[PDB]
Motif scaffolding. Structure first.
Motif, mmCIF file in Angstrom:
data_model
loop_
_atom_site.group_PDB
_atom_site.id
_atom_site.type_symbol
_atom_site.label_atom_id
_atom_site.label_comp_id
_atom_site.label_asym_id
_atom_site.label_seq_id
_atom_site.Cartn_x
_atom_site.Cartn_y
_atom_site.Cartn_z
ATOM 1 N N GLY A 93 34.284 8.448 36.339
ATOM 2 C CA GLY A 93 33.565 7.237 36.118
ATOM 3 C C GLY A 93 33.258 7.396 34.423
ATOM 4 O O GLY A 93 32.991 8.438 33.860
ATOM 5 N N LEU A 94 33.104 6.171 33.987
ATOM 6 C CA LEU A 94 32.769 6.245 32.414
ATOM 7 C C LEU A 94 31.710 4.891 32.520
ATOM 8 O O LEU A 94 31.753 3.966 33.042
ATOM 9 C CB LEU A 94 33.841 5.560 31.769
ATOM 10 C CG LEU A 94 35.301 6.670 31.918
ATOM 11 C CD1 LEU A 94 36.358 5.817 31.413
ATOM 12 C CD2 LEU A 94 34.879 7.957 31.218
ATOM 13 N N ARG A 95 30.716 5.035 31.353
ATOM 14 C CA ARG A 95 30.015 3.848 31.165
ATOM 15 C C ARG A 95 29.165 3.960 29.689
ATOM 16 O O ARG A 95 29.450 5.158 29.229
ATOM 17 C CB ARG A 95 28.951 4.000 32.311
ATOM 18 C CG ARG A 95 27.812 4.990 32.248
ATOM 19 C CD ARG A 95 26.973 5.129 33.556
ATOM 20 N NE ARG A 95 25.792 5.822 33.348
ATOM 21 C CZ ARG A 95 25.156 6.086 34.533
ATOM 22 N NH1 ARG A 95 25.183 5.648 35.637
ATOM 23 N NH2 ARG A 95 23.809 7.130 34.133
ATOM 24 N N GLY A 96 28.413 2.953 29.573
ATOM 25 C CA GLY A 96 27.562 3.020 28.418
ATOM 26 C C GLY A 96 28.423 2.569 27.025
ATOM 27 O O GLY A 96 27.692 2.270 26.026
ATOM 28 N N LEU A 124 25.943 2.495 40.927
ATOM 29 C CA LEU A 124 26.175 1.127 40.326
ATOM 30 C C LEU A 124 25.400 0.681 39.135
ATOM 31 O O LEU A 124 24.392 1.169 38.859
ATOM 32 C CB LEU A 124 25.745 0.271 41.527
ATOM 33 C CG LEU A 124 26.217 0.519 43.079
ATOM 34 C CD1 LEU A 124 25.610 -0.471 44.013
ATOM 35 C CD2 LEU A 124 27.728 0.584 42.861
ATOM 36 N N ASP A 125 26.039 -0.123 38.496
ATOM 37 C CA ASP A 125 25.417 -0.617 37.232
ATOM 38 C C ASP A 125 24.503 -1.680 37.392
ATOM 39 O O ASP A 125 24.386 -2.292 38.653
ATOM 40 C CB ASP A 125 26.779 -1.136 36.532
ATOM 41 C CG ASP A 125 26.388 -1.567 34.834
ATOM 42 O OD1 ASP A 125 25.902 -2.390 34.726
ATOM 43 O OD2 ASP A 125 26.693 -0.529 34.159
ATOM 44 N N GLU A 126 23.884 -1.873 36.390
ATOM 45 C CA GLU A 126 22.785 -2.884 36.656
ATOM 46 C C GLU A 126 23.467 -4.261 36.467
ATOM 47 O O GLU A 126 22.658 -5.243 36.851
ATOM 48 C CB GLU A 126 21.732 -2.708 35.307
ATOM 49 C CG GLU A 126 20.965 -1.489 35.413
ATOM 50 C CD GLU A 126 21.702 -0.354 34.794
ATOM 51 O OE1 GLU A 126 22.819 -0.270 34.546
ATOM 52 O OE2 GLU A 126 20.973 0.643 34.469
ATOM 53 N N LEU A 127 24.534 -4.212 35.577
ATOM 54 C CA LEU A 127 25.189 -5.956 35.521
ATOM 55 C C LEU A 127 26.523 -5.802 36.298
ATOM 56 O O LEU A 127 26.804 -6.760 37.050
ATOM 57 C CB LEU A 127 25.385 -6.101 34.137
ATOM 58 C CG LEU A 127 23.957 -6.334 33.396
ATOM 59 C CD1 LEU A 127 24.247 -6.865 31.967
ATOM 60 C CD2 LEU A 127 23.061 -7.503 34.359
ATOM 61 N N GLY A 140 25.605 6.401 22.705
ATOM 62 C CA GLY A 140 25.335 6.297 24.221
ATOM 63 C C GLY A 140 26.440 6.245 25.100
ATOM 64 O O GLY A 140 26.401 5.077 26.215
ATOM 65 N N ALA A 141 27.389 6.808 25.036
ATOM 66 C CA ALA A 141 28.543 6.782 26.022
ATOM 67 C C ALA A 141 28.537 8.255 27.113
ATOM 68 O O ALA A 141 28.157 9.020 26.651
ATOM 69 C CB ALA A 141 30.029 6.699 25.695
ATOM 70 N N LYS A 172 31.863 -4.059 28.921
ATOM 71 C CA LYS A 172 30.298 -3.590 29.363
ATOM 72 C C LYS A 172 30.391 -3.216 31.030
ATOM 73 O O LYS A 172 31.248 -3.754 31.808
ATOM 74 C CB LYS A 172 29.640 -4.972 29.296
ATOM 75 C CG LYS A 172 29.301 -5.339 28.136
ATOM 76 C CD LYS A 172 28.112 -6.623 27.495
ATOM 77 C CE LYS A 172 28.952 -7.746 28.309
ATOM 78 N NZ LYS A 172 29.957 -8.426 27.554
ATOM 79 N N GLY A 173 29.532 -2.666 31.284
ATOM 80 C CA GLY A 173 29.198 -2.172 32.730
ATOM 81 C C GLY A 173 29.874 -0.473 32.849
ATOM 82 O O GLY A 173 30.380 0.058 32.064
ATOM 83 N N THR A 174 29.916 -0.280 33.970
ATOM 84 C CA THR A 174 30.218 0.947 34.585
ATOM 85 C C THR A 174 31.795 0.791 35.281
ATOM 86 O O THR A 174 31.895 -0.187 35.846
ATOM 87 C CB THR A 174 29.471 1.604 35.623
ATOM 88 O OG1 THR A 174 28.140 1.706 34.909
ATOM 89 C CG2 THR A 174 30.046 3.000 36.089
#
Ligand SMILES: Nc1ncnc2c1ncn2[C@@H]1O[C@H](COP(=O)(O)OP(=O)(O)OP(=O)(O)O)[C@@H](O)[C@H]1O
Ligand SMILES: Nc1ncnc2c1ncn2[C@@H]1O[C@H](COP(=O)(O)OP(=O)(O)OP(=O)(O)O)[C@@H](O)[C@H]1O
Ligand SMILES: [Mg+2]
Ligand SMILES: [Mg+2]
Lengths: 233, 97, 246, 198, 49, 212, 148, 84, 49, 49
Positions: free
Chosen positions: A228-231, C24-27, B86-87, A207-209
């Motif tokens: 960067g990676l996220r989601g 920055l991420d929300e969590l 959603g990635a 979870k997170g970025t």
């Protein structure tokens, strides 16, 4: 005079104890190695408990010391406090200052941190008596205690529709095992509090970025490549 | 009693091998590489639970090949989508090899 | 309802970062890279932008985490580069107002390793403009030019509705940050700054902080005036009389 | 050079007196407002200062401060008598719960005298006064005299505070816990204290 | 209470701002005759304090 | 500027207190030890920072004093923060005799090494043997048993003076010893050729010596 | 010349270990496990068996590293259980001689959390004897006891 | 130190060599590779600790798990091997 | 000091500060010649004081 | 300083016409003799001589 002062002090103490008790519940069942819970233990010092009771109920025995106009109220409080527990010494400091110290409610409270370790009961948290990860987790716990207390304190000076941001760090996060990190994520998520953690790639929280860093030399100068990676999840 | 034993799995090392072999062509031809397209094409070859690890490893292999000259322009890159659910990915195109 | 959030962190002309922005991420936001890549450098940037006080700022190594002051070097100078450097934060309040807060950093020339720092704040910026664009000029050369505060003030004042505030003391800067809900407590005095920094740095290195443990009541309990001011007013007549007699 | 805060600490006007008391072995409790606050403020540096003497500065878990010498101590050491530890353990026992209602924190010499005589075994009492003694009035008078003497020694250690008048009535400080027993989970203090006294 | 709701509440409660909350108001009825030392207009309200 | 040693303490005083020789010397000086020329390390350290140490110990209401013969020692005041004590009269008899030995050129040939027997013989030579015997035992009349008791008491006092730094035993022989200049404080009542009573009164006023 | 080597480490009646023996490697030995598993404890046992000087031993947390603290508690006592305890090392000398060094540890009854140490050494022990068995007596049905 | 004692020691003994490192997880793969080659070139023994198995293809490794069990604690140890 | 510094890892403050004492060994041949000069220099210090 | 102490008057007076070496400097080190700024204590360090 007398009783009413005792009542305001008692109510202030009671309110602080209750708020602490509310903060205390959010930290139940936090798993950090063999630590399973954390508390802020609040107690009242005896030498002040008896003083508060005397001021509540034996005022007719000391009224001479209170209505004597040659000395002020805070001085009266200091003199009464020396009359009880006579073995106490005073460091050549003005009785006025000791009086104002007795007027400050915080001085009546004794504070400790305790942890529910393993098979044992509640123990005072000593750094030397814990592993590394347990120490880190306990530190995070106390820090969120402080942040919650400060937000409750200031809200009476802030707009009705303002909620401050909350963010904390953790360097060399590789020191924590997966279970501990899951616990920490659960805490921060329940507290709406952001985290920034650094690790030399050993941990990959889904979870997170995430940001990948690589330092290079380009045109004879140091340069950092960032991705960067996220989601995910 | 006598000590028991447990063994590791080499699936991720194998994954790194396939990715590095697949990616070597870009350097040899010095072809401009875009992480968005490459990730979108390469994630289609594995199921969803494994996507995250594939993305991580692919990024680890790709960054060793040259640099992106756009990074010195002061212009941030966008967050490109690379699959459903959603990635997202953020990276400039790699130009200087 | 709808707590505020930090949105991004931007570095300009730091050691290894000419111009970089982190979303920055929300969590949870995770920094990852080999040894010496520059992770701790980014956190140094964050905290220095948050608390621009050179008396407190001390980035000791993670090993030897708890020792004394020791050297006279605070460990910050080496993270900058020749010229002008910036560190900025982008924040979204519960009101959904976009506010940009940051500082300008420069290496003071001399034998010793010293730094000069100046805070500033911008409000009303359109959502379409990024910090890196504000702080750099895209001149013909391969690499852009970082523009000083004079150029920045001229560039911002030209915009419609955008306000640029430049502070002379840290106290004013913290006051504005508190009023906008960026921090949980308004740092009245240097002691408050010290405690806030204690909190941040204790979180950064990790472990049961010694200083937090010593002064637990000072941190966890608010101070109440009600019990006192009655008696200060009642005491006033005697105080004045005593002073007059002396 | 010297650390700035250490120089500040030992520059303070309170230091010479506190140093003289500490080197004598006195214990600093929460009663001594100024001294206790001073130690709380400058502990981190005073510990280093006294380590230079091969002597340890310890803060007991109850809250009181005191010095513990090592074998290589640079300060000349001295040692208490058997009767001294006997009386100390008695005082630790008297730091009881019914004490609050029984005496409101203020005892008398007779309480301790009678407690000592009642609780100890006769053989060690004779060993304290003299082996040739046997249940005689003069022996009891000598034992009373010795009790007063050792009680004054303990007052110099700060264990017990005499009320300011010529009569021998006193109050017990928290630092008396130094004589106390080891505490294990759930154990009753009365029982363990008695177990050691036996 | 915050500064934003303070004027609203002060207008709402009017003269009764400085009254006392007492959940029954019948227990005061016997005490009341004794009140010879009090502000010229005392306000009492019923509810959970 | 702030956070600067000079705000709280002179640099030379802090430099002295930070030295590695300070703890040993402080512990010994408070114990009453006298410092002569022979223990170079300590004596040179005292000479280097004399004024700083005098100003420091003044906080305790005690004077760090330097005798003309070159040896340092501590003399507490009436309001002293450090306890004060007085020597016994037998200690004085042996001390004055040790002084007379140090001066004596007839025994310079010994090259500083004396034996307890020689000291005893000199003492009995000058003092009133039998009347001095009164202090060893109230019934002494010259018996050899009581003589041995006197010799043993002398031996014990000589050991105590060794602790005060007034005399050094030889490294391997405890029956022989060497003097130090600190012994000259036993002559304080006669070093000036004037009325003894006024000398005595001046000494007692200065805190050097008490009566009995 | 053939350099000497450490063969193994043995713990008896430590906090969490009743009788456990780690066989060391010629080059590198790694300890893994979640937080609180007992890795640092194993380190501490080794170093204690190497330098039993109780004045020196001071086991701080990994955090607070490098801070000279003078802590009230050195942190060793809590790592021991009640009763007798051991910590021993087996070494192969360059002369190909097997020597077993070690210490007997024991808590001290009393308010102060003190510890007692008594070193010892064994030479010429047959190669077939394991320290774990040498230090224990088989009492009952596979319910061994430790011996002083 | 080993060179200094060359005179006192008997000719035929070379002393043992051993060092420690806690929280090895702070080091990345390249750094650990460097450390291993250094220590093996010097015939130096090492004992290292980390929450996760940071060295899978060199030396021996043990895995520790703590179990709460009948109101006391017990540690279970199992070995790990590079390949399976 | 050596083992403890290895255990906690990193640049040990105490080791570097006294590096001479830890690395450079002592030599007896130097002492044997210096004994005579040591006597002489002690004598000189006596006279100077 | 070793050159200053080693080479003596009668032979090396012809060498001493250099600006860096002279006899009096041995006594000049008397200033350095009194107390160098040593910090940590073990065994026994004392002075320039
Ligand atoms: N004050 C300084 N002076 C000079 N070089 C510095 C300074 N601070 C950091 N560096 C160098 O900058 C690079 C990045 O350091 P940094 O502490 O940010 O690394 P990191 O990625 O956090 O590493 P790790 O997580 O392993 O501690 C390293 O080469 C470090 O040597
Ligand atoms: N002195 C002590 N007193 C009580 N419990 C202790 C003491 N020292 C360690 N423990 C406990 O023993 C268990 C093992 O701790 P230890 O530090 O050895 O574990 P670890 O696996 O090395 O952990 P980490 O990697 O987090 O340091 C932990 O529960 C720790 O709390
Ligand atoms: Mg780092
Ligand atoms: Mg551990």
């Amino acid at each position: 005079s007398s009783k009413s002062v005792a009542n305001i002090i008692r109510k202030t103490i009671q309110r602080e104890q209750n708020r602490i008790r509310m903060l205390n519940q959010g930290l139940q069942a936090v798993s950090f190695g063999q630590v399973r819970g954390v508390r802020l233990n609040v107690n009242v010092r005896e030498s002040h408990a008896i003083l508060l009771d005397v001021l509540s109920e034996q005022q007719e025995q000391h009224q001479d010391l209170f209505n004597s106009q040659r000395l002020t109220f805070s001085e009266a409080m200091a003199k009464l406090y020396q009359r009880l527990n006579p073995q106490v010494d005073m460091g050549q400091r003005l009785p006025q200052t000791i009086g104002e110290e007795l007027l400050d409610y915080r001085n009546y409270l004794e504070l400790d941190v305790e942890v529910n370790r393993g098979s044992d009961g509640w123990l005072k948290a000593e750094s030397g008596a814990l592993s590394t990860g347990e120490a880190i987790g306990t530190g995070m716990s106390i820090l969120v205690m402080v942040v919650q207390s400060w937000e409750e304190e200031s809200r009476r000076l802030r707009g009705k529709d303002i909620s401050p941001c909350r963010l904390l760090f953790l360097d060399e996060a590789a020191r924590l095992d997966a279970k501990s990190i899951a616990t920490l994520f659960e805490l921060c998520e329940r507290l709406q509090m952001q985290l920034i953690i650094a690790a030399p790639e050993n941990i990959s929280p889904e979870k997170g970025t995430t940001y990948k860093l690589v330092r290079k030399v380009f045109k004879n100068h140091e340069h950092v490549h960032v991705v960067g990676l996220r989601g995910f999840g | 009693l006598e000590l028991e034993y447990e063994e590791f799995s080499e699936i991720n090392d194998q994954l790194a091998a396939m990715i590095e072999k697949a990616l070597l062509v870009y350097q040899q031809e010095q072809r401009p590489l875009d992480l968005g397209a490459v990730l979108r094409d390469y994630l289609a070859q594995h199921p969803l639970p494994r996507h995250f690890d594939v993305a991580r490893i692919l990024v680890d292999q790709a960054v060793r090949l040259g640099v992106a000259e756009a990074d010195f322009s002061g212009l941030p890159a966008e967050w490109l989508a690379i699959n459903d659910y959603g990635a997202k990915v953020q990276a400039h195109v790699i130009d200087t090899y | 309802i709808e707590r505020g959030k930090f949105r991004s962190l931007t570095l300009v002309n730091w050691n290894g970062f000419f111009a970089r922005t982190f979303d920055l991420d929300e969590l949870v936001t995770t920094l990852s890279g080999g040894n010496g890549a520059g992770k701790s450098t980014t956190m140094a940037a964050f905290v220095t932008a948050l608390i621009p006080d050179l008396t407190l700022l001390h980035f000791r190594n993670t090993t030897e985490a708890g020792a004394t002051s020791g050297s006279r070097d605070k460990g910050l100078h080496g993270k900058l580069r020749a010229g002008v450097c910036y560190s900025t934060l982008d924040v979204i309040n519960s009101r959904h107002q976009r506010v940009v807060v940051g500082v300008r950093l420069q290496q003071v020339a001399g034998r010793d390793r010293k730094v000069d720092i100046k805070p500033f704040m911008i409000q009303g910026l359109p959502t379409a403009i990024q910090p890196t664009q504000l702080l750099t000029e895209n001149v013909g050369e391969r690499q852009a030019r970082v523009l000083p505060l004079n150029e920045l003030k001229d560039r911002l004042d030209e915009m419609e509705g955008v306000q640029f505030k430049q502070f002379n003391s840290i106290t004013d800067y913290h006051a504005q940050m508190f009023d906008l809900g960026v921090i949980p407590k308004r740092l009245r005095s240097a002691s408050d700054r010290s405690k806030f920094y204690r909190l941040i740095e204790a979180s950064l290195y990790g472990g049961i902080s010694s200083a937090i443990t010593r002064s637990l009541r000072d941190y966890l309990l608010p101070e109440n005036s009600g019990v006192r001011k009655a008696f200060q007013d009642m005491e006033a007549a005697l105080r004045e009389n005593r002073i007059t007699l002396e | 050079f010297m650390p700035v805060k250490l120089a500040q600490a030992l520059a303070n006007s309170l230091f010479p007196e506190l140093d003289s008391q500490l080197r004598a072995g006195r214990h600093i409790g929460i009663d001594d407002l100024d001294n206790h606050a001073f130690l709380m403020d400058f502990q981190e540096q005073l510990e280093e200062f006294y380590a230079r003497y091969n002597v340890e500065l310890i803060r007991a878990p109850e809250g009181f401060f005191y010095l513990r010498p090592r074998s290589t101590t640079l300060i000349p050491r001295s040692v208490l008598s058997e009767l001294d530890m006997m009386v100390g353990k008695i005082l630790c026992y008297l730091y009881l719960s019914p004490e609050r209602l029984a005496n409101q924190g203020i005892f008398t010499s007779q309480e301790l005298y009678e407690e000592l005589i009642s609780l100890a075994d006769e053989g060690k009492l004779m060993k304290f006064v003299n082996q040739r003694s046997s249940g005689s009035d003069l022996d009891k008078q000598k034992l009373q005299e010795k009790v007063r003497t050792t009680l004054n020694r303990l007052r110099r250690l700060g264990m017990v505070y005499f009320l300011p008048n010529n009569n021998n009535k006193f109050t017990i400080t928290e630092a008396v816990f130094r004589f106390g027993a080891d505490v294990r989970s759930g154990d009753d203090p009365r029982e363990i204290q008695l177990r050691m006294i036996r | 209470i915050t500064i934003d709701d303070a004027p609203y509440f002060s207008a709402l409660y009017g003269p009764a701002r400085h009254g006392i909350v007492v959940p029954d108001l019948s227990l005061v009825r016997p005490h009341l005759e004794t009140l010879e030392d009090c502000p010229e207009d005392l306000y009492l309200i019923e509810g959970d304090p």
